Design a protein around this ligand. Sequence first.
Ligand SMILES: *[C@@H]1O[C@H](CO)[C@@H](O[C@@H]2O[C@H](CO)[C@@H](O)[C@H](O)[C@H]2NC(C)=O)[C@H](O)[C@H]1NC(C)=O
Ligand SMILES: *[C@@H]1O[C@H](CO)[C@@H](O[C@@H]2O[C@H](CO)[C@@H](O)[C@H](O)[C@H]2NC(C)=O)[C@H](O)[C@H]1NC(C)=O
Ligand SMILES: *[C@@H]1O[C@H](CO)[C@@H](O[C@@H]2O[C@H](CO)[C@@H](O)[C@H](O)[C@H]2NC(C)=O)[C@H](O)[C@H]1NC(C)=O
Ligand SMILES: *[C@@H]1O[C@H](CO)[C@@H](O[C@@H]2O[C@H](CO)[C@@H](O)[C@H](O)[C@H]2NC(C)=O)[C@H](O)[C@H]1NC(C)=O
Ligand SMILES: *[C@@H]1O[C@H](CO)[C@@H](O[C@@H]2O[C@H](CO)[C@@H](O)[C@H](O)[C@H]2NC(C)=O)[C@H](O)[C@H]1NC(C)=O
Ligand SMILES: *[C@@H]1O[C@H](CO)[C@@H](O[C@@H]2O[C@H](CO)[C@@H](O)[C@H](O)[C@H]2NC(C)=O)[C@H](O)[C@H]1NC(C)=O
Ligand SMILES: *[C@@H]1O[C@H](CO)[C@@H](O[C@@H]2O[C@H](CO)[C@@H](O)[C@H](O)[C@H]2NC(C)=O)[C@H](O)[C@H]1NC(C)=O
Ligand SMILES: *[C@@H]1O[C@H](CO)[C@@H](O[C@@H]2O[C@H](CO)[C@@H](O)[C@H](O)[C@H]2NC(C)=O)[C@H](O)[C@H]1NC(C)=O
Ligand SMILES: *[C@@H]1O[C@H](CO)[C@@H](O[C@@H]2O[C@H](CO)[C@@H](O)[C@H](O)[C@H]2NC(C)=O)[C@H](O)[C@H]1NC(C)=O
Ligand SMILES: *[C@@H]1O[C@H](CO)[C@@H](O)[C@H](O)[C@H]1NC(C)=O
Ligand SMILES: *[C@@H]1O[C@H](CO)[C@@H](O)[C@H](O)[C@H]1NC(C)=O
Ligand SMILES: *[C@@H]1O[C@H](CO)[C@@H](O)[C@H](O)[C@H]1NC(C)=O
Lengths: 50, 418, 198, 85
Amino acid sequence: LTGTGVLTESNKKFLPFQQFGRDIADTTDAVRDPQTLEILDITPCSFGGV
Amino acid sequence: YTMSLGAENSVAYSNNSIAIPTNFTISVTTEILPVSMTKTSVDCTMYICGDSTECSNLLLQYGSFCTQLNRALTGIAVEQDKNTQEVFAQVKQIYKTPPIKDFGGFNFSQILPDPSKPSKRSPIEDLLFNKVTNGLTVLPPLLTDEMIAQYTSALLAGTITSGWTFGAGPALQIPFPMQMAYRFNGIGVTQNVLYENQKLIANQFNSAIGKIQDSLSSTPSALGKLQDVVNQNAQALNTLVKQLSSNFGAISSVLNDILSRLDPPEAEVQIDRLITGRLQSLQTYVTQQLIRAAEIRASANLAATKMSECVLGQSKRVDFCGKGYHLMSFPQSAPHGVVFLHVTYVPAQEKNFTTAPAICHDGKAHFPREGVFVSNGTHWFVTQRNFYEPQIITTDNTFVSGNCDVVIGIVNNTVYDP
Amino acid sequence: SALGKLQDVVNQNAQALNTLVKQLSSNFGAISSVLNDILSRLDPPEAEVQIDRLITGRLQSLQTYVTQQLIRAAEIRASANLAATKMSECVLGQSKRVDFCGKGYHLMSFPQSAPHGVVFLHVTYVPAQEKNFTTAPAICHDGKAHFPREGVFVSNGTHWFVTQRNFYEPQIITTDNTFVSGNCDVVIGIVNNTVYDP
Amino acid sequence: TRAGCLIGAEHVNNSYECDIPIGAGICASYQSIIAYTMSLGAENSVAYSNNSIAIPTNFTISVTTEILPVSMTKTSVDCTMYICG
Ligand SMILES: *[C@@H]1O[C@H](CO)[C@@H](O[C@@H]2O[C@H](CO)[C@@H](O)[C@H](O)[C@H]2NC(C)=O)[C@H](O)[C@H]1NC(C)=O
Ligand SMILES: *[C@@H]1O[C@H](CO)[C@@H](O[C@@H]2O[C@H](CO)[C@@H](O)[C@H](O)[C@H]2NC(C)=O)[C@H](O)[C@H]1NC(C)=O
Ligand SMILES: *[C@@H]1O[C@H](CO)[C@@H](O[C@@H]2O[C@H](CO)[C@@H](O)[C@H](O)[C@H]2NC(C)=O)[C@H](O)[C@H]1NC(C)=O
Ligand SMILES: *[C@@H]1O[C@H](CO)[C@@H](O[C@@H]2O[C@H](CO)[C@@H](O)[C@H](O)[C@H]2NC(C)=O)[C@H](O)[C@H]1NC(C)=O
Ligand SMILES: *[C@@H]1O[C@H](CO)[C@@H](O[C@@H]2O[C@H](CO)[C@@H](O)[C@H](O)[C@H]2NC(C)=O)[C@H](O)[C@H]1NC(C)=O
Ligand SMILES: *[C@@H]1O[C@H](CO)[C@@H](O[C@@H]2O[C@H](CO)[C@@H](O)[C@H](O)[C@H]2NC(C)=O)[C@H](O)[C@H]1NC(C)=O
Ligand SMILES: *[C@@H]1O[C@H](CO)[C@@H](O[C@@H]2O[C@H](CO)[C@@H](O)[C@H](O)[C@H]2NC(C)=O)[C@H](O)[C@H]1NC(C)=O
Ligand SMILES: *[C@@H]1O[C@H](CO)[C@@H](O[C@@H]2O[C@H](CO)[C@@H](O)[C@H](O)[C@H]2NC(C)=O)[C@H](O)[C@H]1NC(C)=O
Ligand SMILES: *[C@@H]1O[C@H](CO)[C@@H](O[C@@H]2O[C@H](CO)[C@@H](O)[C@H](O)[C@H]2NC(C)=O)[C@H](O)[C@H]1NC(C)=O
Ligand SMILES: *[C@@H]1O[C@H](CO)[C@@H](O)[C@H](O)[C@H]1NC(C)=O
Ligand SMILES: *[C@@H]1O[C@H](CO)[C@@H](O)[C@H](O)[C@H]1NC(C)=O
Ligand SMILES: *[C@@H]1O[C@H](CO)[C@@H](O)[C@H](O)[C@H]1NC(C)=O
């Protein structure tokens, strides 16, 4: 699962069978690192209009 | 079942009977009008393609579609601010109420701003604000909710302290039981009726304002017109998001999977399918947003008309400013909307009387100058049309035109001479 | 920037035409945006595909242009219905509607033709040079309450008069311009003053 | 600002009318480029009391302009010639 984002620490406690996380709008906002079983929030980079 | 339109009401019509009201109800009704929407802006290039440079290189083959979508959304976004500007910014003077709230028994605490609240909103406006709950950006509105509340506070202070004079020029102060009497004369009821029954009218007005607050606090579907606009905008944005998960006939909905699994000659075809699907989705979204923007602009033009004609003046238009004879109206800010509290006069406790078009006296026909001839069975009086106030038929309230041989239904009665 | 509303419509229509003309320069994924180049370079089995791509791109552009043209036509029709209402109610009559025919008390209006538009010159009456007076709802005289027929009781400090509401014109409080209803015990704020009898 | 970061405009504590809208109550104007919270109106306190009235002693005949668009340019597009020539 690839993408671009800011990977921060997450307070969402996954169940052990779950790997990725989705919001209402079906966008991956939470993920589990495969090396160390920790949960990371994926905040989209700060795009803006100039 | 087969539905029923209404209860039958056979009006007791005859050629010489009239019904005259003997009492009145000061009725306050709510009217909720949407003004603006959420200002949404979509980066078309990022929505179709994200950060894929091959996708943007293929998207440049389609020309200036993204420029047209961005310009249409920019036009909608500035149209919402123009709508709010036309609705609420109808005064260039920020009026305040006096610190002493001596309005002859009339209570405006539920509609005036609360100093204890940090948002400086009225209790009704506070309840209204409590009852409303990938390249996408939401532009903030130009007027904040505090400044819209300040505009409504200025309008309320102007219409309380100065009448309709502030809407036509400089604000000329006038006592509120005099303003009310002027409004009574606008609907054709004499000033004396207001002055004699001023305590009852103030009590009815305060009771109606409290019933408005109770009805807003007790009905979940009161603010459904604003909630429908909010739900439509959120559901359209959610549908535009969910259209990204569709492959539109390609092997995958992800551009990175296509660019990593295929060489560019076939990835160009798959990305082209995804581009035309996402472009069709974005064009559909922008078209329905333009249609909803036209609808919201029509509603905001209506709201500006009601602001000008019901709040800044007294309107003779039937059912434009509430049900009944319109007395005044009060504006209240709402999330993306305006709530008009229409204070109207409803006649009540009507009574039958025997009526005649003219009075025959000394071979002359007498017609009422402003009222109507009524009879309780034995004696004839003249009264104003919207309230029972019997007076002796004199030459001061009647006028003479012709003899008694022409008017059909003329009756014989004496006409007093002062 | 006085005539910006008409110039906005003119600029939007000219910009829509310029965008529609500019959309012919795009190939929409084909080898060229020129139809003659495709028809002179390729056999009809593959020129059919290239021309099909150009056709669907140009048809999408034309349908888009017609869609915003219909939306702008609806907006201009609403504005023209408003302008016809203003022509009927402000020019052909005197309107009681507040701020429908200008700021202030509306007197009359003049229509003027404009390129793709109309300009209404609203002649209105604005009150000015206001003055404080001490006012009362009624005059108590001979145990009777007197109320103004059309005006308002004012006082300059010592003497009471009745005047019309939108212009200061003090007149002696008489029976000709007042009417009697009830006694003085009911009306809150009634004051004592004589009422002249002609 | 709540609209975003504004670089190149000097924020001032004075309130003026909105010249160029920025958003969230912020507007920009040229006088250098300044950014400010826009004023809604001049503040007027109405001298209300329960027995005083204000009566006009004069008037102004005021003529104002109202510009309303009526029609557009009637454009027709030959669909076959536009797509195909
Ligand atoms: C005025 O008089 C008419 C007729 O006397 C009243 O109409 C009647 O009302 C009763 C009670 O509702 C009905 O049962 C009759 O059928 C009505 N008659 C007709 C011909 O309609 C009327 O109620 C009176 N108005 C008031 C205010 O008392
Ligand atoms: C006109 O209607 C009002 C109410 O709308 C009447 O006031 C009520 O009078 C009764 C008896 O006098 C009281 O018990 C109520 O408390 C009053 N209500 C209010 C809100 O004050 C009034 O009496 C009616 N007048 C006439 C002449 O019918
Ligand atoms: C105007 O109305 C308000 C609310 O309708 C009145 O405030 C109430 O006052 C009573 C007694 O003072 C309290 O028990 C209530 O809790 C108050 N309600 C609220 C919402 O604060 C007020 O007294 C009325 N009169 C004036 C002159 O303001
Ligand atoms: C119709 O109204 C008149 C005046 O309001 C009534 O006449 C009065 O009736 C009372 C009741 O007996 C007498 O005390 C008064 O002296 C009467 N005044 C005059 C000038 O005669 C009359 O009774 C009413 N008729 C009906 C049928 O209600
Ligand atoms: C109302 O008054 C007129 C005039 O006083 C009455 O007309 C008279 O009627 C009688 C008999 O009907 C005639 O003999 C007279 O010649 C009439 N005089 C005139 C001048 O026309 C009329 O009858 C009265 N109506 C009622 C209902 O009493
Ligand atoms: C209020 O207006 C009345 C009428 O204009 C003033 O009464 C007149 O005042 C002048 C100047 O003192 C006298 O010459 C007249 O004789 C007065 N007329 C009468 C009928 O008394 C009155 O002075 C004004 N009061 C104030 C405070 O300006
Ligand atoms: C207005 O005039 C009335 C009547 O002339 C005054 O009422 C009288 O007041 C005195 C003293 O307060 C009492 O002794 C009388 O009994 C009252 N008579 C009546 C009929 O009420 C009233 O005080 C005057 N008001 C002003 C402000 O001058
Ligand atoms: C009418 O009288 C009131 C109070 O006597 C005047 O209001 C005052 O006006 C001055 C001058 O601008 C201010 O400094 C005060 O703050 C005002 N007082 C209040 C309570 O607002 C008012 O100007 C007078 N109107 C006219 C036309 O002279
Ligand atoms: C009402 O206002 C008008 C102006 O709007 C005043 O007319 C001016 O009066 C001064 C002094 O008499 C002259 O110098 C000006 O030339 C006049 N202007 C015009 C356009 O005629 C008028 O005097 C005011 N009247 C009152 C009673 O205040
Ligand atoms: C995988 O390797 C990491 C390396 O730090 C180790 O910490 C972890 O215990 C290993 N096992 C699992 C199941 O993650
Ligand atoms: C009203 O109708 C009655 C019959 O119901 C009739 O006798 C009378 O003349 C009529 N009056 C008028 C003015 O038409
Ligand atoms: C107006 O208020 C004063 C107190 O400020 C009071 O004495 C007077 O009776 C009031 N008049 C009316 C008509 O309410």
